[PDB]
Design a binder for this molecule. Structure first.
Ligand SMILES: CN1Cc2cc(Cl)ccc2-n2c(nnc2[C@H]2CC[C@@H](Oc3ccccn3)CC2)C1
Length: 374
């Protein structure tokens, strides 16, 4: 009977590998990777404080053979660790959404980790509040908890998590499409790129502006990296009366925007979704139009950065999908036995025993996803 005894080691090993890699290599200390280390330590703590004695309870026939002092402490630890594990993914999703949506100050982590850990602690507080002790957390004494704690641990995070998770993808998709149409060789490119990015409307104004030319020149001077190449391209486009001149002007402007460290993460995220070939062709056309002899080494850097954003999204989606596939049955049945009229208690309690053990296996699979997708 070594089936579950051995599984403990992969969980702890994968969690401690994530603990060490983020704090040692220094090549992977991105903003989200700090949340990954908190999730890793949370899943490492369940390896030594949840799995061993819970599986030892099997030999005791659901009885507590240890000192009775720590039993409420153990239940508190279990609830705290599950809540932290879910809320860390929730925090990752909401952080990604808020960073992509409003990168003005994000571009220019311990506090967020403390916030989520304190929230989980304040979620798990009520648990401390002849015959022998039997820690099974009976539905009678812990009645309101089985509903409220389950709602606050699974349903409350899963609502926002799903939305925030997609909210980020939405922005990428918005750009992807807008950018593909901008590289499709009509003045519909700007009308969509304006909403995709959020100066952009000034380009559609050009396709004209008698007094907005000063503002346009000021905006062009607002990008020092492109310097006066953008201004020269704008003057040429004004002289050449749009046609292909406006096309290479907007291509150069998009390349310069992707060059700015303010919009670079968002634009790389949008590029992550899409054919990734038409976008490269358009960016290369912009680089050629912009002069900029080092342009190729920059557009290739942009495309390399875009792949990174994409890679992350994939590794994240999988983890989330697993979380949803594995934890959901347990929390679904944990509400069924609270509200019933003829449901046999044994028939629902048998499935809860396997379902609670199923949810904890997700601790040892998140590092596996990273290792496989690295
Ligand atoms: C005998 N034991 C089975 C059990 C085994 C293992 Cl290995 C872990 C936990 C339990 N076990 C028991 N009773 N409870 C639990 C926990 C703790 C409460 C949790 O409920 C939650 C969890 C998070 C948020 C809200 N409620 C269900 C899992 C009875």
């Amino acid at each position: 009977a070594l089936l579950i005894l051995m599984v403990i080691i992969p969980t702890i090993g994968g969690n401690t590998l994530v603990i060490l890699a983020v704090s040692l290599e220094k090549k992977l200390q991105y903003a989200t990777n700090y949340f990954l280390m908190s999730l890793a330590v949370a899943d490492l703590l369940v390896g030594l404080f949840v799995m061993p004695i819970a599986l030892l309870t099997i030999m005791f026939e659901a009885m507590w053979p240890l000192p009775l002092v720590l039993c409420p402490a153990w239940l508190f630890l279990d609830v705290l660790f599950s809540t932290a594990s879910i809320w860390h993914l929730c925090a990752i999703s909401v952080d990604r959404y808020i960073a992509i949506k409003k990168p003005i100050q994000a571009n220019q982590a311990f506090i967020k980790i403390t916030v989520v850990w304190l929230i989980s602690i304040g979620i798990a507080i009520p648990v401390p509040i002849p015959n022998n002790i039997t820690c099974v957390l009976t539905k009678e004494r812990f009645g309101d908890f089985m509903l409220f704690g389950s709602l606050a641990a699974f349903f409350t995070p899963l609502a926002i998590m799903i939305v925030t998770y997609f909210l980020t993808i939405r922005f990428r998709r918005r750009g992807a499409e807008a950018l593909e149409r901008a590289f499709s060789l009509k003045e519909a490119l700007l009308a969509a790129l304006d909403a995709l990015a959020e100066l952009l409307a000034l380009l559609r104004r050009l396709l004209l502006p008698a007094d907005e030319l000063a503002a346009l020149r000021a905006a062009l001077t607002r990008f020092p990296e492109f310097r006066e190449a953008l201004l020269a391209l704008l003057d040429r486009y004004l002289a050449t009366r749009d046609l292909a001149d406006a096309r290479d002007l907007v291509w150069a402007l998009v390349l310069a925007i992707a060059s700015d460290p303010r919009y670079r993460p968002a634009v790389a995220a949008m590029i992550a979704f899409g054919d990734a070939e038409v976008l490269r062709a358009g960016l290369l056309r912009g680089a050629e139009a912009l002069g900029l002899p080092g342009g190729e080494a920059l557009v290739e850097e942009i495309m390399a950065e875009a792949e990174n954003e994409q890679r992350a999204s994939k590794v994240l989606g999988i983890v989330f999908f697993l979380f949803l596939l594995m934890w959901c049955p347990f929390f679904i049945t944990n509400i069924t036995l609270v509200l019933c009229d003829s449901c046999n208690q044994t028939t629902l309690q048998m499935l809860l025993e396997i379902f609670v053990w199923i949810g904890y296996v997700s601790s040892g699979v998140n590092p596996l996803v990273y290792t496989l997708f690295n």
